[PDB]
Design a protein around this ligand. Structure first.
Ligand SMILES: C[C@H]1CC[C@H](c2ccccc2-c2cc(-c3ccccc3)sc2C(=O)O)CC1
Ligand SMILES: C[C@H]1CC[C@H](c2ccccc2-c2cc(-c3ccccc3)sc2C(=O)O)CC1
Lengths: 557, 557
C-alpha cells in the first residue's frame, strides 16, 4: 500500500532556478546574513521523493465510523450548485499553469472560444468515463526559507482544462460543506482576529485548560484510497445536480484516488496512490480527513470536553487537563490511535498549559496593549520565514508577494509593522508603485491587492487597535530580537528613522498615500495622531475572504 | 554635431580580403548560383563612410525626462561588482585582436605577467585621467550576403588592454542592469522559444492587438554625446564601488562619447562623436537608448496598453488597437517623436494585425504542428543570409561558424533542419570532426560548441517539439522554396535522401553521434521514432546563455 511508485525519471524544472539569495542595492538595508537565506529547487526533489514514499496500513474501528456517521448526517443538509464554465473560468489565477492543449490562464479568464470548447470536452469525458486515470504534472516548489536545508516540496496537479472542471463540480461544495460538517472547528472561516477570539474563548471555557497541536508526518502521503473514497461519500451526501454527482464520482476515481505522474519534459515519473497536493479538494479533503481521524482519536484517548480547530492538516485541540502526567499518557493514546488511522506524527505532541505557547498554522496567540492601555489578544508567528522571503522579494519579482500577505494577516505584529511595512513602502514609493495591484495569497487563494488599500483592509480585518499596539509580551519581544540578531536585521532605531521618512514621503502625496502614512506609521512619531475610521473601508467588498481554504486549489478571489 | 569627421586617410584591410564566393567540391551540393553570394570588403568603406556621416539634432521634452526618471529609479536598485583581472581575462575570446603593446588574447587568457601588468597600467591610467580620448581602430567588416551589393559595415574598437578594463568596470553592470530597468521588455533575457512565448502572450493579452517594428536608420550614428552621458548617468544610479564609478566615468569621457579613429596601418582616419560599434557597452547602451526614446515616443503618440520588446537598436511594439485609421496616425506621431530624439527611421513603420507579419531581429513568429498535431509557435527568419553564409563556410574556415549559431537559434525551422543540419553533419562525418569544438555567436557573445552536443542544446532551448515539427505555414513554405530557387539550392527529395544517409552513418557510430542521427534526422524517415528526453541535457550548464546581449563586446563563454 505504497503512497508512490517511481520510474527513476527526474522531477524537472520549467525555467531557470536560483537557490542562493539574489542581492541588489536594497538587500543589506533588510538583512546582512545572506548565506542563511535559500530557495528550494528541483535539485533536491529526489530527497523529497524518498520522504513522501512509504507503506500505509489502516485499521478502522467504531470511534472512526461513529464520527463519520455524524459528519455525513451534517453533510446531508448541504445543497451545492454546479458552476457554469464561465463562472469557473473567472476563478482561475491569471498566472495559472497553461494547458497542454494550446491555451493558457489568460485565455481561460477571457472566456476564449478555444479554452471554453476544450473545457466542455473535458467535462463530457468526465461524465462518460469514470475509470481512466487522469494525467498529472509533478513539479518541485520553489520556496524560500532560513537555514536550520529542507528539500523542495512537491506539487501534483492535473491539466488546466481539468482544473476548470473541478471548480464547476466542486467549488460550491468545498466552499460550503466544511463549515457545515465541522462547525466552529473549521479554521478557514475565521480571519486572524476571529481565530484569536475562538482560541481565547475556548481556553477560558475550560476549568483547567490543556492544549496541544498535532503534526502528522507528510499528511498528504498518509491519505489512503479509503480516505479519499470516504471524502467522496461525504460530498455525495450533499443535495447535488445529477451531472455534479457524476463529475464528482469520476474525479474521485480518475484523479483524487491516484494517477500517473509526468514531469515538465513529458516523461513518466511514477504513480500516486495518495492525496494530490495540487487539486481543488486538497484543502477540504485534508481538513475533513484530519477532523475525522482526530475526533475519533480524541474518543479513543478519552479526552474530556474537547474543542478542536482544524485547517487542512493543521490541528489544535484544547481540552480539560487531568494533570501533567495523565495528559502526557492521553496524548500517547491519541497518537497511537492517529497512527492506526494512518496519520503518524512527525514531532510527538506536547501538552501546553499557556495559550501563548501553542503553535498552530505556524501561529500563536499573543497579547499587547492598545492606545488606551487595554489588553489586546492578536495573532503572531515566528518572523524568520516571513523575513527570509521578504529578503528574496527585495531583489526579485515573484508570482506571490509573501510580504503583502504577511502584512495583511499579521498587521498588528511588532515585526510586520516595524519591518515589513517600513521596508516595502520605502521600495514602492521610490518606484512610484504604490497604485500597482500585486498578487498575494490568503488561505491558499490568490488576491490582487493595491498596497494603497492596506489601511482600509487592516482596519476591516483587525480594527483600529492594529495601528496603536505597543507593550508587547516578553516572549514576543525576545523572539523578534533573537530573529533580528540571527538574520542580521537592523535594530529598532533604524526602522523608526526609516518609518518617519516613509511616513513623511507618503503624507505629502495626499489621498490614499497620506492615509498609508497616517495610519501605518503612527507608531513612529512622538506626537501620535487621533486614528479614526476610514470612510473608504466601508466600500471594500471583503466577501469571499475567510470563508474556506484553497491551498493547491488554483483559486483567484 | 556631426557623427564623424574624416581626414581622407583610407579604411585599410588587416589581411587579404576575398569578395567572390570560394568554391570547393562541396559547394554545388548546397548552392549553384555562386555569383549571387559575395563578401563585403574595405573597397566599399568609402560608401559606408558617406552613409554613417550626418548632423544630429536633438530636442528633448518632458516625456523623455519622465521616462528617464523612471529608468533611473529602477537602476538605483542595482548592485554591481567589479570583476577581478582574472575574471575579465577569462571572458576574453581566444582569437580576440592582439594588443598593440606586445601581447595577445592567449597571453590575457593565461594571466601572463606582461598582459596582467599592461592591464594594471591601463586601469591605473583610467583612474588617474578622465579626459584623454582613447585611441580606436576602425576596420571594414568582411560579411557575406546574397545580392539584392551593400557596402561593408564598420567596426570601431579600443586596444585589448582597454577591453579587459571595460569588463572589470562594466561586465556585471551590462549583464544585470538592462533586465532591472526594462523588465520583460529586455529582449536578450529570452531564448528564441521564450521570445516567441513572450510575443504570443503579449499579442493575446490585448483585446484588439496591433503591432509594429521600428527601424532606425544607422542607429550607432544617431547616438549623440547627450545619449552616451545619459547612459552613464543610468550606470551611475547603481550601487557601485567608488573605483568602478571612476573607471565608468573615465571610459565614458575618453572612449564611449567619442575619440580618434586609426586605420590598420596606424594613420589617423578621423574622429567619432557617436556610438562605437566594438565596445562592451554597445549592446546595453543601444538597448537603453532605444528603449528610452521609444517609450517616450509611445507616450507622445498616445499608444494604449504598450508592450515593447527591445534588443539593441531592434524594437517591437504591441499595443491596444484604437482602430485602423487611429493606429496609422499614432505611428506617424511616434516616428516624428523618434526623429526629434535623433532616431529617424530607415523604412517607415507599418501597423500589423497579424503577429506572423511583424519582422524584428530579422525574425518573425510562425506556426507549425508537432507529432500530436498541436499548433506550435516558433521563431524563423528569411533563410537567404544564413544560406549564403553557409555556402561561404562550406569552402572556407571562418572565425565564427554562422551555420552552427543558426542551427542553435533556428533549430525548429524547416530550412535549418532540412538544409543546415543535413549539409554540415555530412561534412563533419566525412572529416571525422563531429567531436571538434567550433566557435559560434549567440546574442553577440562567443561560445565554443561541439556539434555532437546539438540534440541536448536544442532540447533545452526549444523542447522536443523542435525534432517533430511539420505542416509549416504556406507563407513559410513559399519563402523557403523561393529562397531555394533564388540561390539554386537543391529540392526536398535531395535533402531528404541525404538526411537518411547522414542519419544512417551517425546511428552506427553509437553514443552522442547516434543521438544526433536519431533526434536531428527523425523527420527524414517513414517510420518515425518516438523521441524522449536525453539524460545529458539535464547536466548541460546553459548559465549565461540568454542573460544579456554583447554584440561587439568581445565576450567569450
Ligand atoms: C511597530 C512599533 C510598535 C511599538 C514599538 C515601541 C514603541 C515605543 C517603545 C518601545 C516599542 C517596542 C519596541 C520593541 C522591540 C522589541 C524587540 C525588537 C525591536 C523592538 S517592543 C516595544 C513595545 O512596546 O513593546 C515600536 C515599533
Ligand atoms: C525538416 C523537414 C520537416 C518536415 C518536412 C516534410 C515532411 C513530410 C511531408 C512534407 C514536409 C514539408 C516539406 C516542405 C517543403 C516546402 C518547400 C521546400 C522544401 C520542403 S514543407 C513541409 C511541411 O510539412 O510543412 C520535410 C523536411
Amino acid at each position: 500500500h505504497m503512497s508512490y511508485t517511481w520510474t527513476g525519471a527526474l522531477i524537472t524544472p520549467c525555467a531557470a532556478e536560483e537557490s542562493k539569495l539574489p542581492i541588489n542595492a536594497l538587500s543589506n538595508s533588510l538583512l546582512r546574513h545572506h548565506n542563511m537565506v535559500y530557495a528550494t529547487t528541483s535539485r533536491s526533489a529526489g530527497l523529497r521523493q524518498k520522504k513522501v514514499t512509504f507503506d500505509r496500513l489502516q485499521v478502522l474501528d467504531d470511534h472512526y465510523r461513529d464520527v463519520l456517521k455524524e459528519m455525513k448526517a451534517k453533510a446531508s443538509t448541504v445543497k451545492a450548485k454546479l458552476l457554469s464554465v464561465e463562472e469557473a473560468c473567472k476563478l482561475t489565477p491569471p498566472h495559472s499553469a497553461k494547458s497542454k492543449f494550446g491555451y493558457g490562464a489568460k485565455d481561460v479568464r477571457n472566456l476564449s472560444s478555444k479554452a471554453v470548447n476544450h473545457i466542455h470536452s473535458v467535462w463530457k469525458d468526465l461524465l462518460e468515463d469514470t475509470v481512466t486515470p487522469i494525467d498529472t504534472t509533478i513539479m518541485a516548489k520553489n520556496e524560500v526559507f532560513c537555514v536550520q536545508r529542507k528539500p523542495a516540496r512537491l506539487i501534483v496537479f492535473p491539466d488546466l482544462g481539468v482544473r476548470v472542471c473541478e471548480k464547476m463540480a466542486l467549488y460550491d461544495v468545498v466552499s460550503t460543506l466544511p463549515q457545515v460538517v465541522m462547525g466552529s472547528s473549521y479554521g478557514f472561516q475565521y480571519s486572524p482576529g476571529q481565530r484569536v477570539e475562538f482560541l481565547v474563548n475556548t481556553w477560558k471555557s475550560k476549568k483547567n485548560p490543556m492544549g496541544f497541536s498535532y503534526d502528522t508526518r507528510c499528511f498528504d502521503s498518509t491519505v489512503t484510497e479509503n480516505d479519499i473514497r470516504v471524502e467522496e461519500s461525504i460530498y455525495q451526501c450533499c443535495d447535488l445536480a445529477p451531472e455534479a454527482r457524476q463529475a464528482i464520482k469520476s474525479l474521485t476515481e480518475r484523479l483524487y484516488i491516484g494517477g500517473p505522474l509526468t514531469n515538465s519534459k513529458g516523461q513518466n515519473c511514477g504513480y500516486r496512490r495518495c492525496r494530490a497536493s495540487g487539486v481543488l479538494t486538497t484543502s477540504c479533503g485534508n481538513t475533513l480527513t484530519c477532523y475525522l481521524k482526530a475526533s475519533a482519536a480524541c474518543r479513543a484517548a478519552k479526552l474530556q470536553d474537547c474543542t478542536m480547530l482544524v485547517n487542512g492538516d493543521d490541528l489544535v485541540v484544547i481540552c480539560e487537563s487531568a494533570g501533567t502526567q495523565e495528559d502526557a499518557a492521553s496524548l500517547r493514546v491519541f497518537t497511537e490511535a492517529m497512527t492506526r488511522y494512518s496519520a503518524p506524527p512527525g514531532d510527538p505532541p506536547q501538552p501546553e498549559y499557556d495559550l501563548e505557547l501553542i503553535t498552530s498554522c505556524s501561529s500563536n496567540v499573543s497579547v499587547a496593549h492598545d492606545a488606551s492601555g487595554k489588553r489586546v489578544y492578536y495573532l503572531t508567528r515566528d518572523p524568520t520565514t516571513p523575513l527570509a522571503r521578504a529578503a528574496w522579494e527585495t531583489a526579485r519579482h515573484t508570482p506571490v508577494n509573501s510580504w503583502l500577505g504577511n502584512i495583511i494577516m499579521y498587521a498588528p505584529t511588532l515585526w510586520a509593522r516595524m519591518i515589513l511595512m517600513t521596508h516595502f513602502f520605502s521600495i514602492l514609493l521610490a518606484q512610484e508603485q504604490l497604485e500597482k495591484a500585486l498578487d498575494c495569497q490568503i488561505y491558499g487563494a490568490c488576491y490582487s491587492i493595491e498596497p494603497l488599500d492596506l489601511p482600509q483592509i487592516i482596519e476591516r480585518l483587525h480594527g483600529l487597535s492594529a495601528f496603536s499596539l505597543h507593550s508587547y509580551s516578553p516572549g514576543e519581544i525576545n523572539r523578534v530580537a533573537s530573529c533580528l540578531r540571527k538574520l542580521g536585521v537592523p535594530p529598532l532605531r533604524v526602522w523608526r528613522h526609516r518609518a518617519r521618512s516613509v511616513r513623511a514621503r507618503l503624507l505629502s502625496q495626499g489621498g490614499r498615500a497620506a492615509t498609508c502614512g497616517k495610519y501605518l506609521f503612527n507608531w513612529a512619531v512622538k506626537t501620535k495622531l487621533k486614528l479614526t475610521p476610514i470612510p473608504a473601508a466601508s466600500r471594500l467588498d471583503l466577501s469571499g475572504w475567510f470563508v474556506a481554504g484553497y491551498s493547491g486549489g488554483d483559486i483567484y478571489h
